[PDB]
Amino acid sequence: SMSYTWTGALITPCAAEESKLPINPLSNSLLRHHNMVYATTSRSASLRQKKVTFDRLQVLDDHYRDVLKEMKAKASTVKAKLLSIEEACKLTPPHSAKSKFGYGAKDVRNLSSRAVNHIRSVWEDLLEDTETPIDTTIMAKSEVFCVQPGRKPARLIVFPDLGVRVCEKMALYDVVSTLPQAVMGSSYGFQYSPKQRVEFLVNTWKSKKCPMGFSYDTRCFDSTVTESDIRVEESIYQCCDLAPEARQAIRSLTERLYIGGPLTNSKGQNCGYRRCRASGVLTTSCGNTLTCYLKATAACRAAKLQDCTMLVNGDDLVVICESAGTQEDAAALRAFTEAMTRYSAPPGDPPQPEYDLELITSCSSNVSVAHDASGKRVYYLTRDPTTPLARAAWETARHTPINSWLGNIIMYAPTLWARMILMTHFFSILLAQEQLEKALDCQIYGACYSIEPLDLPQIIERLHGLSAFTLHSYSPGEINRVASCLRKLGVPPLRTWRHRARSVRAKLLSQGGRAATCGRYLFNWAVRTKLKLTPIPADLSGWFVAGYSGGDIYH
């Protein structure tokens, strides 16, 4: 079937839409080629629509069915509870989009009588009505990038009203937080902290006689997902032990929301109909992860690849296996791609087999190595820092709701760029406005978190260990990528950052505790006299459990 159908009516914005990085003394200190940085807008919506709208070919076989049953067997071990209204309400972000029926996120979070009663209605409606399609809104995402030597069109997000999103959580939060791990086991990506992810990739790599590995980029995954795929995904959820009201909710949400529905623009006009994954519902991450894992797992058998270990994060996929010789590896990977095409998951760019772990890009990241205080090799996780930096400039010049910089500091703390540029730049600013204490919103695996910068030393210690404060002797491939990037974007070269860092470090020391602890630990790479570095005195229990991208989750 057609992934989408369009009435012709436009995909509209609901506010002013900003697209150019402004000239600001704060952002210009970080990066100077301001005309290279842009945000996507709805002005580019039609270009995306063209890309996402197509006919899907899908043909299932024995291998598909075989893996599906294996997955269903493990799903049967799961007991899942209903959240109460209170729990589901406490999971709603404070800046989540308001309802059409006269209540917002603040009301939901307070359990105001109005929100609560509409939530009860929507739920009872899900128990009573098993067919009527449920309305969605469609909007062009605002995202920041650097120009390519050639712009990206905005992404399209699609989501139901707030009353439904609370009901999704009641019915499905426990499932989408526990079912993926029981089914995929060590292949479920979102269980791993960055240090744990690198551990798993290195251990898996070093466990093979002759490793070969590849990433596989599916072309616009959400549009490849068929109605069949979403019913199959429901067949997995239904293997859980569920309360009756849960089971019916899941059934109605599947037929009325997840498989498709009408699309409405911001002006209340009808844009079209959807027959694929919606980016903006609770089950997208779980569902995409399961679906990716299922097709890829079956395609591996079809391709005859040997001793496969896969690692899956929604629609991001990486596979490590036993080489069969370079040319036999190439023909097997091509068989794999073709199997996936049949399962309705064709490639964006053809995958290439790799024989050096550092050359594989999964979740926009790659493994690299450095050395700690005592000279031991420490494997860490990094990426091309262009987008982080472009966004960091943008978030310095403009107030955004989510601060990608802070999320990038946490995730990439041990990296060369995050340490010398991000920490330096942002801590210098927070000092100068006396806002070190103030908590800021960031995203980790799609969930929203309110973190305060003064907690970054211990957060980084837990997530990465003391070494993220003492790494040195980075590889030249990595130093070269960073240095080039900076020249391209007009970011000052690293020696400038070193000097700015020393000035910032000295200022944090002459402050107090905590602040000085930032100075001591975060900026020990800058100072002349190297320092002690003992563990730091000071709940991270729910941080790397599951993915929630598009799922409207706050913790």
Author numbering: 1 to 149, 153 to 541, 546 to 562
The paper states:
The RNA-dependent RNA polymerase (RdRp), or non-structural 5B (NS5B) protein, catalyzes HCV RNA replication, i.e. the synthesis of single-stranded positive-strand RNA genomes. The 3D structure of HCV RdRp revealed a ‘right hand’ shape, including ‘fingers’, ‘palm’ and ‘thumb’ subdomains (6–8).
The X-ray crystal structure of quercetagetin bound to the HCV RdRp was solved by means of soaking experiments in apo crystals of NS5BΔ21. The B ring of quercetagetin was clearly apparent in the electron density maps, whereas the orientation of the A and C rings was proposed based on partial density only, because this part of the molecule adopted several conformations. That was the case of the strictly conserved G283 residue which interacts with the 2′-hydroxyl of the template RNA ±1 ribose and makes a hydrogen bond with the B ring of quercetagetin, and of the highly conserved F162 residue which stacks both the sugar of the RNA template pairing nucleotide and the B ring of quercetagetin at its top. Superimposition of our crystallographic structure with the recently published crystallographic structure of HCV NS5B in complex with primer-template RNA suggested that quercetagetin interferes with the ability of the enzyme to interact with RNA. Altogether, these results indicate that quercetagetin inhibits RNA binding to the HCV RdRp through a direct interaction with the enzyme. Due to the conservation of the residues at the quercetagetin binding site across HCV genotypes, this new NNI binding site has the potential for pangenotypic activity.
